[PDB]
Paper text:
DrMoaE structural data with a resolution of 1.9 Å were obtained, revealing that each monomeric protein consisted of three α helices and six β sheets. The α/β structure exhibited a hammerhead fold containing an additional four-stranded antiparallel β-sheet domain. The r.m.s.d. values of 1.19 Å and 0.981 Å were comparable with the Cα atoms of EcMoaE and MtMoaE, respectively, suggesting that DrMoaE was similar to its homologous proteins, with a high degree of overlap of the four-stranded antiparallel β sheet, but a displacement of the α1 and α2 helices located around it. Compared with EcMoaE and MtMoaE, the loop between the β2 and β3 sheets were predominantly disordered, resulting in their apparent deflection. The anion pocket of substrate precursor Z (cPMP) bound to EcMoaE was found to consist of His103, Arg104, and Arg39, which corresponded to His109, Arg110, and Arg45 of DrMoaE, respectively. The His109 and Arg110 amino acid pair of DrMoaE located in the α3 helix was equally capable of forming an anion-binding pocket with the Arg45 of β2 sheet located in another monomer, which matched well with the MtMoaE protein, but exhibited a significant angular shift in E. coli. In the dimer interaction interface, the two anionic binding pockets in the dotted frames were symmetrical to each other. When the corresponding Arg110 in D. radiodurans was mutated to alanine, the gel filtration result of DrMoaE shifted from a single peak of 34 kDa to a single peak of 17 kDa. The DrMoaE dimer disappeared, suggesting that Arg110 had an irreplaceable role in the stable dimerization formation of DrMoaE. In conclusion, our results support that DrMoaE possesses a conserved MoaE protein structure, with a more disordered loop between the β2 and β3 sheets, while the cPMP-binding pocket Arg110 residue is a key site for its dimerization, which responds to the oxidative damage process in D. radiodurans, and is thus able to reduce base damage and genomic DNA mutations to defend against various external stresses.
Molybdenum ions are covalently bound to molybdenum pterin (MPT) to produce molybdenum cofactor (Moco), a compound essential for the catalytic activity of molybdenum enzymes, which is involved in a variety of biological functions. MoaE is the large subunit of MPT synthase and plays a key role in Moco synthesis. MPT synthase is a heterotetrameric enzyme composed of two small and two large subunits encoded by moaD and moaE. MPT synthase catalyzes the conversion of precursor Z (cPMP) into MPT via sulfur transfer of MoaD thiocarboxylate.
Residue numbers in the entry:
A (entry chain A): 9 to 145
B (entry chain B): 10 to 145
The structure:
């Protein structure tokens, strides 16, 4: 009830995250959104194919949320990752954290994005003109 | 590349997102501050926010320029709301888009801490302890 962790093919929405996180007792919400970038360090990309097994990815998310709470205290946590072929400027991940005060929310969001970049079992194939290749990045 | 506004109308995350997202900016970081109840152990009925709108928007644009000095290329969105705001209503929204994630996250964090100090915005929380306006 204080945590939302979902892997989905549907578009990710900040407004849905906001609808879940904001409560009168939580004066602060901090977000991160990752979207597909069109010149990736001097390379032109037209799509990225994301793969995730929802049960294993969501179990990682819920463990991430509990680690964030261990470090930063009371939180509401929103984590979603999108699957499928994603065109540029389309969101692949949304992370949102609400807390009584701003500094815990900012730190918890920061922790989650760095933690999930390491621990999330996501596999992706980028369209660089260099064939199909699936990487755990 | 920069949007800075003081308004009495509701603040919108989805409006910030519409302004920020561009194909070359793969990362966006946001902060929203909402009216908190209870606060310091007492129920808050509302917070009256008052701002010198032209002065405050100039501070916002200088803050966005300082953010770029430290973190490079950015799209920056800053809005602050004025008037009588009830619990869970947003008083400030900050959004930053950058090519990569570290500058977006740290620039957003920089902006909220910077603006907490420099914004000419005065508030009065109605927490039942009389009138008391604070630069907070």
């Amino acid at each position: 009830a204080d945590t939302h962790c979902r892997v989905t093919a549907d578009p990710l929405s900040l407004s849905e995250a906001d609808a879940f996180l904001v409560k009168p007792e939580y004066g602060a919400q901090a977000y991160f959104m990752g979207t597909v970038r069109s010149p990736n360090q001097g390379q032109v990309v037209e799509y990225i194919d994301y793969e995730a097994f929802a049960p294993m990815a969501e179990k990682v998310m819920r463990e991430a949320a509990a680690l964030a709470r261990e470090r930063h205290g009371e939180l509401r946590v929103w984590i979603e990752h999108r699957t499928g072929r994603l065109t540029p400027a389309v969101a692949s991940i949304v992370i949102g954290v609400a807390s009584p005060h701003r500094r815990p929310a900012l730190e918890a969001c920061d922790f989650l994005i760095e933690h999930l970049k390491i621990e999330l079992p996501i596999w992706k194939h980028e369209a660089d003109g260099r064939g199909e290749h699936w990487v755990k990045g």
